């Protein structure tokens, strides 16, 4: 679910950043690890912010919907890191939003690949499952990626332990594809980010 908006692509892949106060060193290390993970696999780079108008701020506060997708023009955009959303996988996901990805399960073609069970979503979190209108996404020829760090698990924001919010429609290698199990960028994430940022080979 790569943004179709050219103005939301960080120019030259440069993403200036500030880390707010109140984080432990341990938490700051996670941010660096997640940023490095993106840097190592794509041409995106994270720079300590000096005087740039647009930049990201890792902000110590309760977890909550909803993060800005891509570069917000003209002022900073906060990433909410709280006690329950400060692990590597979640930060890598949130940085995916920053670089310009919506959730994979909200791709315009998503009903070909999964079913959303809206009844099972926690009230106030349905924003995270709402299908993107087709003009808002340009997938760059890449197919629906069940392995994406931007794809939720079967029960992400579910109302109960044994209830699914997302159910894949079909089998891949004999089973329904595992979703939302990985905590690292997928092959598909990397390929697509490389096209989005026009990275050299
Ligand atoms: C308390 N809190 C942990 C609940 C929660 N459930 O989802 C989320 C965020 C995305 C989870 C990314 C995860 C990465 C690994 C693969 C599966 C998906 C909310 C969100 O979309 N933030 O941008 N918070
Ligand atoms: Zn998200
Ligand atoms: Zn994708």
mmCIF file of N, CA and C in Angstrom, residues 47-180:
data_model
loop_
_atom_site.group_PDB
_atom_site.id
_atom_site.type_symbol
_atom_site.label_atom_id
_atom_site.label_comp_id
_atom_site.label_asym_id
_atom_site.label_seq_id
_atom_site.Cartn_x
_atom_site.Cartn_y
_atom_site.Cartn_z
ATOM 1 N N UNK A 47 18.742 11.033 9.428
ATOM 2 C CA UNK A 47 19.716 12.087 9.770
ATOM 3 C C UNK A 47 19.240 12.804 11.027
ATOM 4 N N UNK A 48 20.138 13.090 11.961
ATOM 5 C CA UNK A 48 19.772 13.885 13.143
ATOM 6 C C UNK A 48 19.301 15.258 12.661
ATOM 7 N N UNK A 49 18.093 15.643 13.053
ATOM 8 C CA UNK A 49 17.507 16.883 12.570
ATOM 9 C C UNK A 49 18.263 18.111 13.093
ATOM 10 N N UNK A 50 18.488 19.081 12.204
ATOM 11 C CA UNK A 50 19.055 20.387 12.555
ATOM 12 C C UNK A 50 18.022 21.495 12.298
ATOM 13 N N UNK A 51 17.821 21.897 11.038
ATOM 14 C CA UNK A 51 16.910 23.023 10.693
ATOM 15 C C UNK A 51 15.827 22.687 9.649
ATOM 16 N N UNK A 52 15.603 21.393 9.396
ATOM 17 C CA UNK A 52 14.680 20.942 8.366
ATOM 18 C C UNK A 52 13.267 21.127 8.908
ATOM 19 N N UNK A 53 12.347 21.569 8.050
ATOM 20 C CA UNK A 53 10.945 21.787 8.429
ATOM 21 C C UNK A 53 10.196 20.494 8.691
ATOM 22 N N UNK A 54 10.415 19.507 7.821
ATOM 23 C CA UNK A 54 9.797 18.193 7.945
ATOM 24 C C UNK A 54 10.784 17.217 8.571
ATOM 25 N N UNK A 55 10.351 16.572 9.650
ATOM 26 C CA UNK A 55 11.142 15.554 10.326
ATOM 27 C C UNK A 55 10.247 14.720 11.228
ATOM 28 N N UNK A 56 10.754 13.565 11.642
ATOM 29 C CA UNK A 56 9.994 12.669 12.519
ATOM 30 C C UNK A 56 10.455 12.846 13.956
ATOM 31 N N UNK A 57 9.528 12.711 14.896
ATOM 32 C CA UNK A 57 9.852 12.800 16.313
ATOM 33 C C UNK A 57 9.359 11.537 17.017
ATOM 34 N N UNK A 58 10.295 10.754 17.547
ATOM 35 C CA UNK A 58 9.963 9.616 18.400
ATOM 36 C C UNK A 58 9.492 10.235 19.710
ATOM 37 N N UNK A 59 8.216 10.048 20.037
ATOM 38 C CA UNK A 59 7.558 10.822 21.084
ATOM 39 C C UNK A 59 7.052 9.909 22.204
ATOM 40 N N UNK A 60 7.551 10.139 23.423
ATOM 41 C CA UNK A 60 7.222 9.279 24.555
ATOM 42 C C UNK A 60 5.814 9.560 25.028
ATOM 43 N N UNK A 61 4.894 8.672 24.681
ATOM 44 C CA UNK A 61 3.498 8.824 25.058
ATOM 45 C C UNK A 61 2.745 7.526 24.752
ATOM 46 N N UNK A 62 1.517 7.375 25.299
ATOM 47 C CA UNK A 62 0.732 6.174 25.045
ATOM 48 C C UNK A 62 0.606 5.818 23.554
ATOM 49 N N UNK A 63 0.611 4.516 23.279
ATOM 50 C CA UNK A 63 0.389 3.990 21.941
ATOM 51 C C UNK A 63 -0.983 4.470 21.464
ATOM 52 N N UNK A 64 -1.090 4.825 20.195
ATOM 53 C CA UNK A 64 -2.409 5.117 19.644
ATOM 54 C C UNK A 64 -2.452 5.333 18.157
ATOM 55 N N UNK A 65 -3.618 5.057 17.586
ATOM 56 C CA UNK A 65 -3.942 5.453 16.220
ATOM 57 C C UNK A 65 -3.888 7.016 16.119
ATOM 58 N N UNK A 66 -3.477 7.624 14.998
ATOM 59 C CA UNK A 66 -2.936 6.981 13.795
ATOM 60 C C UNK A 66 -1.742 7.794 13.253
ATOM 61 N N UNK A 67 -0.714 7.082 12.803
ATOM 62 C CA UNK A 67 0.541 7.706 12.372
ATOM 63 C C UNK A 67 0.383 8.291 10.982
ATOM 64 N N UNK A 68 1.112 9.374 10.719
ATOM 65 C CA UNK A 68 1.112 9.992 9.391
ATOM 66 C C UNK A 68 1.876 9.065 8.429
ATOM 67 N N UNK A 69 1.369 8.955 7.200
ATOM 68 C CA UNK A 69 1.956 8.094 6.182
ATOM 69 C C UNK A 69 2.700 8.947 5.173
ATOM 70 N N UNK A 70 4.001 8.704 5.029
ATOM 71 C CA UNK A 70 4.855 9.529 4.192
ATOM 72 C C UNK A 70 5.277 10.826 4.854
ATOM 73 N N UNK A 71 5.860 11.710 4.060
ATOM 74 C CA UNK A 71 6.349 13.007 4.525
ATOM 75 C C UNK A 71 5.183 14.018 4.644
ATOM 76 N N UNK A 72 4.869 14.434 5.866
ATOM 77 C CA UNK A 72 3.970 15.573 6.064
ATOM 78 C C UNK A 72 4.716 16.835 5.661
ATOM 79 N N UNK A 73 4.119 17.642 4.796
ATOM 80 C CA UNK A 73 4.757 18.906 4.428
ATOM 81 C C UNK A 73 4.730 19.936 5.553
ATOM 82 N N UNK A 74 5.850 20.637 5.749
ATOM 83 C CA UNK A 74 5.878 21.903 6.498
ATOM 84 C C UNK A 74 5.960 21.905 8.023
ATOM 85 N N UNK A 75 5.987 20.729 8.646
ATOM 86 C CA UNK A 75 6.133 20.624 10.107
ATOM 87 C C UNK A 75 6.334 19.176 10.544
ATOM 88 N N UNK A 76 6.793 18.969 11.794
ATOM 89 C CA UNK A 76 7.144 17.627 12.222
ATOM 90 C C UNK A 76 5.972 16.682 12.361
ATOM 91 N N UNK A 77 6.268 15.394 12.327
ATOM 92 C CA UNK A 77 5.270 14.357 12.530
ATOM 93 C C UNK A 77 5.776 13.457 13.638
ATOM 94 N N UNK A 78 4.904 13.189 14.599
ATOM 95 C CA UNK A 78 5.268 12.446 15.788
ATOM 96 C C UNK A 78 5.044 10.969 15.526
ATOM 97 N N UNK A 79 5.956 10.111 15.999
ATOM 98 C CA UNK A 79 5.700 8.678 16.124
ATOM 99 C C UNK A 79 5.478 8.415 17.598
ATOM 100 N N UNK A 80 4.329 7.823 17.924
ATOM 101 C CA UNK A 80 3.963 7.509 19.317
ATOM 102 C C UNK A 80 4.581 6.185 19.763
ATOM 103 N N UNK A 81 5.506 6.279 20.712
ATOM 104 C CA UNK A 81 6.139 5.106 21.279
ATOM 105 C C UNK A 81 5.758 5.088 22.746
ATOM 106 N N UNK A 82 4.966 4.094 23.128
ATOM 107 C CA UNK A 82 4.618 3.860 24.531
ATOM 108 C C UNK A 82 5.110 2.510 24.994
ATOM 109 N N UNK A 83 4.911 2.244 26.291
ATOM 110 C CA UNK A 83 5.287 0.978 26.952
ATOM 111 C C UNK A 83 4.890 -0.254 26.139
ATOM 112 N N UNK A 84 3.705 -0.239 25.531
ATOM 113 C CA UNK A 84 3.237 -1.396 24.769
ATOM 114 C C UNK A 84 3.594 -1.418 23.273
ATOM 115 N N UNK A 85 4.397 -0.473 22.777
ATOM 116 C CA UNK A 85 4.707 -0.416 21.323
ATOM 117 C C UNK A 85 6.102 0.145 21.064
ATOM 118 N N UNK A 86 7.067 -0.398 21.796
ATOM 119 C CA UNK A 86 8.460 0.068 21.731
ATOM 120 C C UNK A 86 9.439 -1.036 21.296
ATOM 121 N N UNK A 87 8.932 -2.178 20.846
ATOM 122 C CA UNK A 87 9.800 -3.244 20.340
ATOM 123 C C UNK A 87 10.169 -3.026 18.884
ATOM 124 N N UNK A 88 11.313 -3.609 18.520
ATOM 125 C CA UNK A 88 11.891 -3.509 17.189
ATOM 126 C C UNK A 88 10.866 -3.659 16.042
ATOM 127 N N UNK A 89 10.107 -4.757 16.040
ATOM 128 C CA UNK A 89 9.124 -5.019 14.975
ATOM 129 C C UNK A 89 8.109 -3.895 14.759
ATOM 130 N N UNK A 90 7.567 -3.392 15.860
ATOM 131 C CA UNK A 90 6.561 -2.317 15.823
ATOM 132 C C UNK A 90 7.186 -1.015 15.339
ATOM 133 N N UNK A 91 8.405 -0.728 15.793
ATOM 134 C CA UNK A 91 9.101 0.476 15.329
ATOM 135 C C UNK A 91 9.424 0.376 13.824
ATOM 136 N N UNK A 92 9.893 -0.797 13.366
ATOM 137 C CA UNK A 92 10.141 -1.000 11.928
ATOM 138 C C UNK A 92 8.844 -0.748 11.115
ATOM 139 N N UNK A 93 7.716 -1.245 11.631
ATOM 140 C CA UNK A 93 6.371 -1.005 11.050
ATOM 141 C C UNK A 93 6.041 0.489 10.984
ATOM 142 N N UNK A 94 6.231 1.185 12.099
ATOM 143 C CA UNK A 94 5.924 2.629 12.171
ATOM 144 C C UNK A 94 6.800 3.456 11.209
ATOM 145 N N UNK A 95 8.052 3.052 11.072
ATOM 146 C CA UNK A 95 8.945 3.661 10.106
ATOM 147 C C UNK A 95 8.497 3.363 8.675
ATOM 148 N N UNK A 96 7.851 2.228 8.454
ATOM 149 C CA UNK A 96 7.232 1.956 7.175
ATOM 150 C C UNK A 96 6.167 2.966 6.834
ATOM 151 N N UNK A 97 5.346 3.339 7.822
ATOM 152 C CA UNK A 97 4.405 4.429 7.638
ATOM 153 C C UNK A 97 5.150 5.703 7.244
ATOM 154 N N UNK A 98 6.173 6.056 8.012
ATOM 155 C CA UNK A 98 6.983 7.238 7.700
ATOM 156 C C UNK A 98 7.482 7.253 6.247
ATOM 157 N N UNK A 99 7.968 6.121 5.733
ATOM 158 C CA UNK A 99 8.584 6.122 4.380
ATOM 159 C C UNK A 99 7.521 6.212 3.274
ATOM 160 N N UNK A 100 6.282 5.856 3.619
ATOM 161 C CA UNK A 100 5.135 6.041 2.741
ATOM 162 C C UNK A 100 4.210 4.868 2.514
ATOM 163 N N UNK A 101 4.202 3.897 3.419
ATOM 164 C CA UNK A 101 3.320 2.741 3.306
ATOM 165 C C UNK A 101 2.148 2.807 4.257
ATOM 166 N N UNK A 102 0.953 2.560 3.704
ATOM 167 C CA UNK A 102 -0.235 2.228 4.483
ATOM 168 C C UNK A 102 -0.131 0.750 4.819
ATOM 169 N N UNK A 103 -1.082 0.264 5.592
ATOM 170 C CA UNK A 103 -1.114 -1.143 5.919
ATOM 171 C C UNK A 103 -1.378 -1.992 4.668
ATOM 172 N N UNK A 104 -0.649 -3.101 4.546
ATOM 173 C CA UNK A 104 -0.778 -4.003 3.379
ATOM 174 C C UNK A 104 -2.210 -4.527 3.188
ATOM 175 N N UNK A 105 -2.862 -4.839 4.303
ATOM 176 C CA UNK A 105 -4.241 -5.333 4.288
ATOM 177 C C UNK A 105 -5.275 -4.246 3.956
ATOM 178 N N UNK A 106 -4.830 -3.013 3.715
ATOM 179 C CA UNK A 106 -5.692 -1.963 3.178
ATOM 180 C C UNK A 106 -5.409 -1.595 1.724
ATOM 181 N N UNK A 107 -4.530 -2.339 1.036
ATOM 182 C CA UNK A 107 -4.374 -2.163 -0.403
ATOM 183 C C UNK A 107 -5.747 -2.178 -1.089
ATOM 184 N N UNK A 108 -5.935 -1.353 -2.139
ATOM 185 C CA UNK A 108 -7.178 -1.365 -2.930
ATOM 186 C C UNK A 108 -7.640 -2.741 -3.427
ATOM 187 N N UNK A 109 -6.686 -3.643 -3.683
ATOM 188 C CA UNK A 109 -6.968 -5.029 -4.095
ATOM 189 C C UNK A 109 -7.091 -6.055 -2.943
ATOM 190 N N UNK A 110 -7.165 -5.587 -1.690
ATOM 191 C CA UNK A 110 -7.040 -6.471 -0.526
ATOM 192 C C UNK A 110 -8.139 -7.523 -0.408
ATOM 193 N N UNK A 111 -9.357 -7.217 -0.863
ATOM 194 C CA UNK A 111 -10.455 -8.200 -0.790
ATOM 195 C C UNK A 111 -10.251 -9.396 -1.735
ATOM 196 N N UNK A 112 -9.310 -9.309 -2.679
ATOM 197 C CA UNK A 112 -8.896 -10.502 -3.429
ATOM 198 C C UNK A 112 -8.033 -11.481 -2.612
ATOM 199 N N UNK A 113 -7.449 -11.004 -1.517
ATOM 200 C CA UNK A 113 -6.426 -11.740 -0.787
ATOM 201 C C UNK A 113 -6.804 -12.070 0.681
ATOM 202 N N UNK A 114 -7.565 -11.190 1.341
ATOM 203 C CA UNK A 114 -8.019 -11.399 2.718
ATOM 204 C C UNK A 114 -9.468 -10.980 2.887
ATOM 205 N N UNK A 115 -10.065 -11.432 3.989
ATOM 206 C CA UNK A 115 -11.341 -10.898 4.492
ATOM 207 C C UNK A 115 -11.072 -10.224 5.829
ATOM 208 N N UNK A 116 -11.589 -9.005 5.986
ATOM 209 C CA UNK A 116 -11.607 -8.297 7.268
ATOM 210 C C UNK A 116 -12.880 -8.721 8.016
ATOM 211 N N UNK A 117 -12.753 -8.992 9.308
ATOM 212 C CA UNK A 117 -13.913 -9.264 10.159
ATOM 213 C C UNK A 117 -14.083 -8.063 11.095
ATOM 214 N N UNK A 118 -14.825 -7.067 10.606
ATOM 215 C CA UNK A 118 -14.941 -5.748 11.251
ATOM 216 C C UNK A 118 -15.588 -5.794 12.655
ATOM 217 N N UNK A 119 -16.499 -6.749 12.849
ATOM 218 C CA UNK A 119 -17.177 -6.998 14.131
ATOM 219 C C UNK A 119 -16.164 -7.284 15.229
ATOM 220 N N UNK A 120 -15.076 -7.965 14.863
ATOM 221 C CA UNK A 120 -14.031 -8.385 15.804
ATOM 222 C C UNK A 120 -12.950 -7.338 16.125
ATOM 223 N N UNK A 121 -12.971 -6.183 15.445
ATOM 224 C CA UNK A 121 -12.001 -5.122 15.691
ATOM 225 C C UNK A 121 -12.422 -4.325 16.927
ATOM 226 N N UNK A 122 -11.443 -3.956 17.752
ATOM 227 C CA UNK A 122 -11.665 -3.093 18.920
ATOM 228 C C UNK A 122 -12.197 -1.721 18.481
ATOM 229 N N UNK A 123 -13.284 -1.223 19.126
ATOM 230 C CA UNK A 123 -13.818 0.095 18.777
ATOM 231 C C UNK A 123 -12.777 1.195 18.822
ATOM 232 N N UNK A 124 -12.735 1.990 17.761
ATOM 233 C CA UNK A 124 -11.741 3.041 17.624
ATOM 234 C C UNK A 124 -10.517 2.648 16.831
ATOM 235 N N UNK A 125 -10.325 1.351 16.568
ATOM 236 C CA UNK A 125 -9.167 0.864 15.787
ATOM 237 C C UNK A 125 -9.493 0.456 14.325
ATOM 238 N N UNK A 126 -10.741 0.651 13.890
ATOM 239 C CA UNK A 126 -11.183 0.263 12.537
ATOM 240 C C UNK A 126 -10.486 1.116 11.464
ATOM 241 N N UNK A 127 -10.035 2.312 11.862
ATOM 242 C CA UNK A 127 -9.201 3.171 11.006
ATOM 243 C C UNK A 127 -8.044 2.384 10.395
ATOM 244 N N UNK A 128 -7.439 1.507 11.209
ATOM 245 C CA UNK A 128 -6.293 0.690 10.774
ATOM 246 C C UNK A 128 -6.627 -0.391 9.726
ATOM 247 N N UNK A 129 -7.913 -0.664 9.498
ATOM 248 C CA UNK A 129 -8.369 -1.730 8.609
ATOM 249 C C UNK A 129 -9.133 -1.226 7.375
ATOM 250 N N UNK A 130 -9.404 0.069 7.340
ATOM 251 C CA UNK A 130 -10.233 0.653 6.320
ATOM 252 C C UNK A 130 -9.488 0.591 4.990
ATOM 253 N N UNK A 131 -10.129 0.053 3.964
ATOM 254 C CA UNK A 131 -9.511 -0.078 2.659
ATOM 255 C C UNK A 131 -9.143 1.269 2.010
ATOM 256 N N UNK A 132 -7.930 1.386 1.480
ATOM 257 C CA UNK A 132 -7.519 2.616 0.787
ATOM 258 C C UNK A 132 -8.265 2.733 -0.545
ATOM 259 N N UNK A 133 -8.688 3.941 -0.889
ATOM 260 C CA UNK A 133 -9.275 4.168 -2.209
ATOM 261 C C UNK A 133 -8.170 4.038 -3.250
ATOM 262 N N UNK A 134 -8.521 3.556 -4.454
ATOM 263 C CA UNK A 134 -7.475 3.172 -5.427
ATOM 264 C C UNK A 134 -6.545 4.305 -5.849
ATOM 265 N N UNK A 135 -7.045 5.539 -5.840
ATOM 266 C CA UNK A 135 -6.215 6.671 -6.222
ATOM 267 C C UNK A 135 -5.184 7.053 -5.185
ATOM 268 N N UNK A 136 -5.302 6.510 -3.972
ATOM 269 C CA UNK A 136 -4.393 6.830 -2.862
ATOM 270 C C UNK A 136 -3.160 5.917 -2.782
ATOM 271 N N UNK A 137 -3.155 4.847 -3.567
ATOM 272 C CA UNK A 137 -2.104 3.848 -3.545
ATOM 273 C C UNK A 137 -1.609 3.593 -4.962
ATOM 274 N N UNK A 138 -0.284 3.536 -5.108
ATOM 275 C CA UNK A 138 0.359 3.057 -6.328
ATOM 276 C C UNK A 138 1.321 1.924 -5.945
ATOM 277 N N UNK A 139 0.926 0.684 -6.224
ATOM 278 C CA UNK A 139 1.686 -0.485 -5.791
ATOM 279 C C UNK A 139 3.004 -0.779 -6.535
ATOM 280 N N UNK A 140 3.272 -0.061 -7.630
ATOM 281 C CA UNK A 140 4.512 -0.167 -8.418
ATOM 282 C C UNK A 140 4.741 -1.571 -8.981
ATOM 283 N N UNK A 141 3.666 -2.202 -9.437
ATOM 284 C CA UNK A 141 3.728 -3.549 -9.996
ATOM 285 C C UNK A 141 3.970 -4.686 -9.013
ATOM 286 N N UNK A 142 3.982 -4.399 -7.717
ATOM 287 C CA UNK A 142 4.270 -5.404 -6.724
ATOM 288 C C UNK A 142 2.973 -6.044 -6.263
ATOM 289 N N UNK A 143 2.966 -7.365 -6.117
ATOM 290 C CA UNK A 143 1.774 -8.073 -5.668
ATOM 291 C C UNK A 143 1.613 -8.011 -4.151
ATOM 292 N N UNK A 144 0.392 -8.315 -3.724
ATOM 293 C CA UNK A 144 -0.022 -8.370 -2.315
ATOM 294 C C UNK A 144 0.961 -9.255 -1.519
ATOM 295 N N UNK A 145 1.549 -8.712 -0.452
ATOM 296 C CA UNK A 145 2.663 -9.329 0.258
ATOM 297 C C UNK A 145 2.168 -9.770 1.640
ATOM 298 N N UNK A 146 1.805 -11.047 1.766
ATOM 299 C CA UNK A 146 1.393 -11.606 3.057
ATOM 300 C C UNK A 146 2.495 -11.521 4.119
ATOM 301 N N UNK A 147 3.768 -11.476 3.704
ATOM 302 C CA UNK A 147 4.925 -11.387 4.633
ATOM 303 C C UNK A 147 5.318 -9.962 5.080
ATOM 304 N N UNK A 148 4.668 -8.939 4.548
ATOM 305 C CA UNK A 148 5.005 -7.557 4.873
ATOM 306 C C UNK A 148 4.992 -7.227 6.373
ATOM 307 N N UNK A 149 5.975 -6.452 6.822
ATOM 308 C CA UNK A 149 5.931 -5.852 8.185
ATOM 309 C C UNK A 149 4.745 -4.883 8.335
ATOM 310 N N UNK A 150 4.188 -4.447 7.196
ATOM 311 C CA UNK A 150 2.982 -3.594 7.183
ATOM 312 C C UNK A 150 1.681 -4.377 7.200
ATOM 313 N N UNK A 151 1.755 -5.702 7.241
ATOM 314 C CA UNK A 151 0.559 -6.523 7.291
ATOM 315 C C UNK A 151 0.297 -6.931 8.731
ATOM 316 N N UNK A 152 -0.942 -6.764 9.176
ATOM 317 C CA UNK A 152 -1.334 -7.190 10.500
ATOM 318 C C UNK A 152 -1.381 -8.728 10.618
ATOM 319 N N UNK A 153 -1.415 -9.189 11.863
ATOM 320 C CA UNK A 153 -1.675 -10.591 12.158
ATOM 321 C C UNK A 153 -3.191 -10.820 12.085
ATOM 322 N N UNK A 154 -3.575 -12.083 12.072
ATOM 323 C CA UNK A 154 -4.981 -12.498 12.078
ATOM 324 C C UNK A 154 -5.844 -11.883 13.192
ATOM 325 N N UNK A 155 -5.243 -11.594 14.344
ATOM 326 C CA UNK A 155 -5.962 -11.058 15.495
ATOM 327 C C UNK A 155 -5.389 -9.735 16.017
ATOM 328 N N UNK A 156 -4.742 -8.946 15.163
ATOM 329 C CA UNK A 156 -4.258 -7.616 15.582
ATOM 330 C C UNK A 156 -5.517 -6.773 15.874
ATOM 331 N N UNK A 157 -5.497 -6.067 17.011
ATOM 332 C CA UNK A 157 -6.652 -5.320 17.525
ATOM 333 C C UNK A 157 -7.982 -6.101 17.541
ATOM 334 N N UNK A 158 -7.919 -7.377 17.905
ATOM 335 C CA UNK A 158 -9.118 -8.184 18.038
ATOM 336 C C UNK A 158 -9.769 -7.971 19.400
ATOM 337 N N UNK A 159 -11.097 -8.064 19.427
ATOM 338 C CA UNK A 159 -11.864 -7.946 20.667
ATOM 339 C C UNK A 159 -11.663 -9.130 21.630
ATOM 340 N N UNK A 160 -11.152 -10.263 21.143
ATOM 341 C CA UNK A 160 -10.907 -11.438 21.999
ATOM 342 C C UNK A 160 -9.807 -12.348 21.484
ATOM 343 N N UNK A 161 -9.153 -13.056 22.410
ATOM 344 C CA UNK A 161 -7.988 -13.917 22.129
ATOM 345 C C UNK A 161 -8.176 -14.842 20.914
ATOM 346 N N UNK A 162 -9.324 -15.532 20.861
ATOM 347 C CA UNK A 162 -9.616 -16.531 19.809
ATOM 348 C C UNK A 162 -10.451 -16.029 18.612
ATOM 349 N N UNK A 163 -10.641 -14.710 18.492
ATOM 350 C CA UNK A 163 -11.375 -14.102 17.370
ATOM 351 C C UNK A 163 -10.419 -13.425 16.380
ATOM 352 N N UNK A 164 -10.637 -13.654 15.089
ATOM 353 C CA UNK A 164 -9.786 -13.077 14.032
ATOM 354 C C UNK A 164 -10.360 -11.762 13.515
ATOM 355 N N UNK A 165 -9.481 -10.781 13.314
ATOM 356 C CA UNK A 165 -9.813 -9.555 12.586
ATOM 357 C C UNK A 165 -9.531 -9.707 11.086
ATOM 358 N N UNK A 166 -8.571 -10.567 10.722
ATOM 359 C CA UNK A 166 -8.205 -10.789 9.323
ATOM 360 C C UNK A 166 -8.066 -12.291 9.014
ATOM 361 N N UNK A 167 -8.664 -12.724 7.909
ATOM 362 C CA UNK A 167 -8.615 -14.117 7.465
ATOM 363 C C UNK A 167 -8.177 -14.186 6.008
ATOM 364 N N UNK A 168 -6.974 -14.746 5.741
ATOM 365 C CA UNK A 168 -6.567 -14.895 4.340
ATOM 366 C C UNK A 168 -7.572 -15.765 3.569
ATOM 367 N N UNK A 169 -7.782 -15.448 2.294
ATOM 368 C CA UNK A 169 -8.835 -16.100 1.496
ATOM 369 C C UNK A 169 -8.473 -17.461 0.953
ATOM 370 N N UNK A 170 -7.194 -17.696 0.679
ATOM 371 C CA UNK A 170 -6.785 -18.886 -0.067
ATOM 372 C C UNK A 170 -5.511 -19.465 0.504
ATOM 373 N N UNK A 171 -5.138 -20.632 0.002
ATOM 374 C CA UNK A 171 -3.943 -21.314 0.455
ATOM 375 C C UNK A 171 -2.741 -20.949 -0.400
ATOM 376 N N UNK A 172 -1.573 -20.895 0.229
ATOM 377 C CA UNK A 172 -0.279 -20.714 -0.439
ATOM 378 C C UNK A 172 0.660 -21.783 0.145
ATOM 379 N N UNK A 173 1.265 -22.584 -0.725
ATOM 380 C CA UNK A 173 2.012 -23.773 -0.300
ATOM 381 C C UNK A 173 1.225 -24.611 0.740
ATOM 382 N N UNK A 174 -0.044 -24.880 0.415
ATOM 383 C CA UNK A 174 -0.876 -25.827 1.152
ATOM 384 C C UNK A 174 -1.570 -25.356 2.414
ATOM 385 N N UNK A 175 -1.323 -24.117 2.839
ATOM 386 C CA UNK A 175 -1.964 -23.543 4.035
ATOM 387 C C UNK A 175 -2.340 -22.087 3.770
ATOM 388 N N UNK A 176 -3.202 -21.517 4.611
ATOM 389 C CA UNK A 176 -3.439 -20.068 4.567
ATOM 390 C C UNK A 176 -2.124 -19.368 4.947
ATOM 391 N N UNK A 177 -1.754 -18.297 4.218
ATOM 392 C CA UNK A 177 -0.467 -17.659 4.512
ATOM 393 C C UNK A 177 -0.381 -17.107 5.932
ATOM 394 N N UNK A 178 0.752 -17.359 6.624
ATOM 395 C CA UNK A 178 0.885 -16.706 7.915
ATOM 396 C C UNK A 178 0.937 -15.206 7.673
ATOM 397 N N UNK A 179 0.250 -14.456 8.515
ATOM 398 C CA UNK A 179 0.303 -13.007 8.420
ATOM 399 C C UNK A 179 0.731 -12.406 9.758
ATOM 400 N N UNK A 180 1.503 -11.327 9.685
ATOM 401 C CA UNK A 180 1.871 -10.533 10.851
ATOM 402 C C UNK A 180 2.720 -11.288 11.864
#
